[PDB]
Amino acid sequence: ASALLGNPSAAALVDQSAQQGFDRASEAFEEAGFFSSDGLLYGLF
Amino acid sequence: ASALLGNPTQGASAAALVDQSAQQGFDRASEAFEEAGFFSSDGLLYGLF
Amino acid sequence: ELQARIAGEQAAIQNETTKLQMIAQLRQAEQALISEQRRERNMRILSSGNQGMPTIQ
Amino acid sequence: ELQARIAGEQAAIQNETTKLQMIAQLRQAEQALISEQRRERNMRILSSGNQGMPTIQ
């Protein structure tokens, strides 16, 4: 929680960081959905 | 900075060089993505590149 | 009178031509609407506003 | 006079036919313009002239 973070359970920080990453992936998938064709590039992203 | 580069550099750091080379590579990738954008279909080949 | 009758008949065929044009436009609009519904479904599945995921239990 | 009236009526239906053709062309042009706007947005997102990236802090 605070030994090296400097910000005052561990099954939490990993989930938050992964949530940020997966949110970016979800936004990429949404952009892929917008461009029906020429959109699978965003799917690969 | 200059031990083996030979070409004189006025003054800078080290990771700097990793950033410059990675920038060249990523710029080529970005140009490939731009080409993929140009060809709407038949353009995902450039995306794979 | 027969000439004017045939002229009216031509007018009727003109009307059918206009109706066929209108039917073709409606066909195109219907295909566009079906595509729009497809894309709405696709957007709903992939929306970034979704918050759910499977739970480990 | 009735024959000339029916002839004018045919001319009116002809005009409607031309108008429908013009509407169809405009429909096609509008779809093309929407596609152009989509591709402009796509080009703007993927442009190689962009210089930004996330910062580590």
Half-sphere exposure of C22 (CA within 13 A, CB side): 8
Which chain A residues have a beta carbon less than 8 Å from that of C46?
Answer: 26, 29-30, 32-33
Resolution in A: 4.3
CB D20, CB C18: distance < 8 Å = yes
Tell me the H-state helices in chain B: 15-38, 44-48
* Shortest distance, CA B3 to any CA of chain D (angstroms): 29
CA–CA separation, B16 and B29 (whole Å) = 20
Helix, strand, coil shares of chain B, percent, nearest 5, are: 60, 0, 40
CA–CA separation, B30 and D46 (whole Å) = 7
Distance from CA of residue B22 to its chain's centroid? 5
Q: Quick one: tokens of C49? A: 């506003």
Phi-psi region for residue A6, left (φ > 0), alpha (ψ -120 to 50) or beta?
Answer: left
**Chains sharing 3 or more CB pairs under 8 A with chain C:** A, D
Q: Quick one: tokens of C10? A: 């031509």
CA–CA separation, D53 and D55 (whole Å) = 6
Q: Quick one: tokens of A11? A: 């099954």
User: Which among A31, A38, A45 is the top mutation candidate for probing chain B, defined by the most B β-carbons within 10 Å of its own β-carbon?
Assistant: A38
Could you report how far apart the first and last alpha carbons of chain C are, in Å?
89
The count of residues in chain D is 57
Instruction: Find tokens 């561990």 and name the residue.
Output: A10
Burial of B36 (0-12, 13-18, 19+ CB in 10 A): buried
CB C28, CB A3: distance < 8 Å = no
Helix or strand holding residue B47 (H, E): helix B44-48
CA–CA separation, A33 and A13 (whole Å) = 30
* Shortest distance, CA D46 to any CA of chain B (angstroms): 6
